[PDB]
Design a protein around this ligand. Sequence first.
Ligand SMILES: [Zn+2]
Lengths: 100, 99, 49, 240, 99, 182, 50, 59, 111, 175
Amino acid sequence: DDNMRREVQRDLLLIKHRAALDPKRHYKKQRWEVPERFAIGTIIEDKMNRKERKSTILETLMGDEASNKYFKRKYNEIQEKSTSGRKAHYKKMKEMRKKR
Amino acid sequence: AKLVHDVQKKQHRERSQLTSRSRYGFLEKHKDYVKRAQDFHRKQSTLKVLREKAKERNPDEYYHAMHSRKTDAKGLLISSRHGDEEDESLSMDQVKLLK
Amino acid sequence: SRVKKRKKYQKAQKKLKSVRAVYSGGQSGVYEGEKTGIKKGLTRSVKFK
Amino acid sequence: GGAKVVIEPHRHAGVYIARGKEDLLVTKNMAPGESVYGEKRISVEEPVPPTKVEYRVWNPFRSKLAAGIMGGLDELFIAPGKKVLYLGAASGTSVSHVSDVVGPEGVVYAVEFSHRPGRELISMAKKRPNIIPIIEDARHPQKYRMLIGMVDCVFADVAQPDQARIIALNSHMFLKDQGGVVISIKANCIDSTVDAETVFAREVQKLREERIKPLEQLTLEPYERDHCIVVGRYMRSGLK
Amino acid sequence: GLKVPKAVQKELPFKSQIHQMKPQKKKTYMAKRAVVLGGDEKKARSFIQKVLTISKAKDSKRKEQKASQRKERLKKLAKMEEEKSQRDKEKKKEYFAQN
Amino acid sequence: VRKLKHHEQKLLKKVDFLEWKQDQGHRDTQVMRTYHIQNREDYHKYNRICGDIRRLANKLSLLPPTDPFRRKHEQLLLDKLYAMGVLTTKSKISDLENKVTVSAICRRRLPVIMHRLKMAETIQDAVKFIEQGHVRVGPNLINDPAYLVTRNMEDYVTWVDNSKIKKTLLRYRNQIDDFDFS
Amino acid sequence: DDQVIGKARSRTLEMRLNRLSRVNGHQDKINKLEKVPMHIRRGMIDKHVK
Amino acid sequence: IKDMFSSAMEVARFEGAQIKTVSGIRGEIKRALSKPEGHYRAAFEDKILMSDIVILRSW
Amino acid sequence: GPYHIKYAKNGTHLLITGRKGHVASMDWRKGQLRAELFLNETCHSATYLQNEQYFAVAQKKYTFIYDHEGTELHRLKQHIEARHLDFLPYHYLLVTAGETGWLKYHDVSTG
Amino acid sequence: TRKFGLVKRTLNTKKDQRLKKNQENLTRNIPQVSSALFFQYNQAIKPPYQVLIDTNFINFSIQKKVDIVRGMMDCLLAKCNPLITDCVMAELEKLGPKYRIALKLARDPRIKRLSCSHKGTYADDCLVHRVLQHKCYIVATNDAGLKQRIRKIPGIPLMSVGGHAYVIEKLPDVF
Ligand SMILES: [Zn+2]
């Protein structure tokens, strides 16, 4: 129901966007729109410790450390290509004219 | 290359804006000019299309959605920025419950 | 002329993993998963006639 | 290890895919809470209390039908109400996974010749109540002609060079018309004197001579070397 | 962007009118009511954003590189199809000289 | 009627209870479905007229290609149908046999002229609006959907004044002047 | 021509156009026969040969 | 155009010439301006920018 | 107007044909009417064809053939002015005579 | 109380499912490349070869007087199982009694014979289907069309009567 889909709408985003999570993994191409029926599951190891078993994929990815460094680096350079010549650039050119 | 030396197809580098004229930044060359000119040309082409439609308007035009859509005092269109799947004014029982 | 053909063979069996799915040597350790995805729409088998 | 995955169904009915950052092939568990060969299990909490039913991973390096399924076959004939005759139930590794593809309303007849694998089969078929272990040589089907009748599919993972004759006998006896036939061929086990495509062509020719029309074959190449799976339907009257 | 004038876009037909919604000047009630969670939830929101923008930039990069791939083999395949067509239209003429 | 088995389908091949040969492929039904023609004999009353134009163009092409009676009458018929709107252009004379067509005479009707003038949203709503009596050509109100609106006379298709539809489009653009009733 | 009235005119023109067309046009496509059913085209041919 | 000449006599000497910017926008010297001495009016293919350098190739 | 009444060949269905415009095919011993159509021209006679599934009406001039729920299936270009319809049910022939002095048989299966 | 824009109801030949043209109200399949193949090599086939013959190979071998088994052994310098499918044999039997020599030279004890299970007797589609199925055969032929099909698909060698003994085309180890 929607009361569960609004809970797990985030790790479904990560399973949809797996190919961005890790620069060395490179999944094979499917789209994977969210299925109508699914079920969240936890892997039972038979006889990661108890300190680091979580309740989302998202919490595992956030509790990881060098992945957050990679996401911050890649986001910042995506940002500084996206902001490259648009409007702070344009007014720095106009005020470079108006200075002298 | 077939009958061309590697010392024949060398790379002629390009020049910069003058040091005196440096506040008008980036002396632009022909690739930058065609990036300028073809963008102005496509924006003029869609502006010419919209002026053609405004001339050929036919003011006895009747679509049924002009019972919901409405036009402001300047003549332009009012687009309700929230939705049009939700109602803008929430009634008094709704405001009772939200408050 | 030997190390040329040493390397245009290493390119060659790297391109071969793009057409076929080359037998790597079996399961390495514990089975982790498919590691690249399971596609349930695609069926890569030879139908008969 | 302890990660969270989402279970989603496959194209085949009865088998599921477990998506995470590396997705698994998964089936339901007919005997929950115990692993048949030490494979890792996944435990959803299906919503009266919410019951913890659980799912079991199908390792394709240890299972030829899993290798065929995730290499991608068009039509398995193993489905959630079926009666399957598994020939060469080596122990219950793939037979457990076939059993809970088949479900509680269907039957899996697991035929095995060797006795210590037979003991493993009976100690598994107690807690999977739809596996009928039959310890008998599969080359003489008139022996267990009294115990089985009219299966819907015939899986065959025997390792014998008279494979197609064994399959022809059991299919003529117990498989119904347009029933399914799945063959696992191991080329170096059939005969090492020829090449693998020659022996695959010869065994497929033998199948269509015993009027199992072959639909499909798959080489299952990153998992086994020089194996194959041939799917066919037992046409019984006019392959044409 | 394209800035289409007021004197045109108030005289456009009913199908072609431009839906341009005005900004909100007033701090409205639902905007000042609605609640945003903080701390762990704001870093979850930031993380989902960072994943989704790296995914979108990766996909855009991959599709532009695929465009550059198939444009170049399109050019070389135009060379090959013209070559084969020329040999075709000479072999046909040679066939009709022989017959 | 029961999706005949194979020996039946072989034994009775010409049996068809819906599509017959004299129906001509149900084109009466099909173009009257396209242009929302109200009563059943309008297609065939237009078809008599297309038959008369095509008969005359046949007999008039059978004359020698140079003689002025042929040339004059083909040009008179061609200008007549173009000014009636049945033809789209008077360029070639094979339009008198190829492109005169009951669907052309139907596209020249009044609800279809309404729809192509954007005065309604569809041909069914144009039929509803002029059955409801909103549409006049010139000064006088037109009430039947079969009216044929020639090339000069489609500059005068308007709504009537005091119509609620004229009121609502003027007040959509909030140009409604209640002085002159609308 | 400039004096040949109707049916002789149409068939004279059709004859001339077929004769000029047969040089360069394909033999399979210049002479298309009318779609006549089998039991009445065979009947037409049998009576015409009689 | 500001300074490639020093006076209206020089621009009068060079009226009607073809100039171009560095961006390939062609153009032509139209008339010597009056009020500043070495300035002139030129008409180009389309709107040149302030960051450009006009050019008169001569031998 | 005056209603021309026709039954089916078994007793199951009834088909009435008003002289002004009103045709109706009904189950007369259930209460089930399965076609009712007001063809605004002066209809004369009507018959079923081979079932309750198709019925032929002799309208102002042209004879029409409607299906079970009343949709028009055919407009007979011949049968110029029918007044009397009939059906030969072993031979599948709709027979027609009227104000022309002509008797026409229309094979209903092939058409 | 009545509706506007009233129409008669007539049968809708675009949408009515009761009539013949309107009677017709995923899983992709990319066949995997054969594991027998390298890029274009077919590294898997090794002697004794299995050589699928067709009818004009038989007729050209009789018209040139090359024996079947000895000509194949001379061409490949290996051993051979020449194979006649049932459609090739049916094509030879259909060719008439002007080819009785070819028929009783194809009925030979040394020439083994497959049994194709498909309707009709079209040898070129039978040979092409069972050769791109399996990539373990040699196709011996002399049809221009069949030779062009077979030399377009990869990893399938091709024997043909040319001159006064057999020639072999896409086999890379003949000497
Ligand atoms: Zn065959």
